[PDB]
DNA sequence: GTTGGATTTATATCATTTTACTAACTGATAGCGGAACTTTGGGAGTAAAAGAGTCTCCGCGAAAATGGC
């Protein structure tokens, strides 16, 4: 289960690797939390997801107990690693009081 | 012993909801003023001659302060 995002990135959650079409050799390392965040965004391409849903699905599976702002820190790190401008979002959008959005094109190879 | 990622605090910027202050419409209602009309209010007048008041009541006594001589 590997994804293509916005016709530019290749995302591997089983290996938590991010690959660029511009930089195929360069594979960037994303933490578990960011990988699970993007994985749920891909599992629901462009339908609005809820902050409780993300905190649950990410940290209820591993039994971790963290505060709500940890989700905000995870999204901030994902934004800095995706080189996505928060002012003009192209990959991840913040829908206030509803959660987040994956506006980029998502394709499922296999 | 350690150290670095992450899992929280720290500070700032952005978005959403509400407040503060506009205007326009709607609908009425009261108040004031004028014109007309009906009612009220004051005044003048009456040409046989007619030419002196009541007024019932009037079942009180003892003492003192007043004129009048």
UniProtKB/Swiss-Prot annotation:
Recorded superkingdom: Bacteria
Subcellular location: Cell membrane
GO biological process: regulation of DNA-templated transcription
Keyword check for DNA repair: no
GO molecular function per UniProt: DNA binding; phosphorelay response regulator activity
Primary localization: membrane
GO cellular component, one term: plasma membrane
Keywords per UniProt: Activator, Cell membrane, DNA-binding, Membrane, Transcription, Transcription regulation, Transmembrane, Transmembrane helix, Two-component regulatory system
Name of the protein in question: Cholera toxin transcriptional activator
Gene name tied to this protein: toxR
Full-protein interval shown: 19 to 127 of 294
């Amino acid at each position: 289960m590997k994804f293509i995002l916005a016709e530019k990135f290749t995302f591997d959650p089983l290996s938590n690797t991010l690959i660029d079409k511009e930089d195929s050799e360069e594979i960037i390392r994303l933490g578990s939390n960011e990988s699970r965040i993007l994985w749920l965004l891909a599992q629901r391409p462009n339908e609005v997801i809820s902050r409780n849903d993300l905190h649950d699905f990410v940290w209820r599976e591993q039994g971790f107990e963290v505060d709500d702002s940890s989700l905000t820190q995870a999204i901030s790190t994902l934004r800095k690693m995706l080189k996505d401008s928060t002012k003009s979002p192209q990959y991840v959008k913040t829908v206030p009081k509803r959660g987040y959005q994956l506006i980029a094109r998502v394709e499922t190879v296999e």
